[PDB]
Amino acid sequence: ARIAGVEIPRNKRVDVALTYIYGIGKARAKEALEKTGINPATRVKDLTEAEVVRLREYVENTWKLEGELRAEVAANIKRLMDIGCYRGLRHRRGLPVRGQRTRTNARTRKGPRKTVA
């Protein structure tokens, strides 16, 4: 049914269809079905049609997630650009932030090789 209001991952297993939400993976699924006593070993194709909303105002209140998360993400960075620190420059210049090596690798901050020869 209409599960996670924002995104909807119907016709899958709950706990795991949870994981496919910007901010959900595994232990997030643990405390959920261990605070709202709803059994995890279920689908969504046939459950009690009331156990759809009890996960909302729990998951959808205390913390932040989905579109309500990349703000903080986008937050803790623009500053670091406008702050002039060397770490802020990392994100910009196509470079890594947990300081690796750039004589090789660092494709994950790049994406393509460019050769030039």
């Binding site: 947990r98 300081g99 690796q100 090596r101």
Partner: peptide, 24 residues
């Protein structure tokens, strides 16, 4: 830099003894 100074990555290259490991 896997196992060096100021990141967090991985230690199957730096070891751990004397590093932060229990002594006495």
């Amino acid at each position: 830099g896997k196992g060096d100074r100021r990141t967090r990555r991985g230690k199957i290259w730096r070891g751990t003894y004397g590093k932060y490991r229990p002594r006495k």
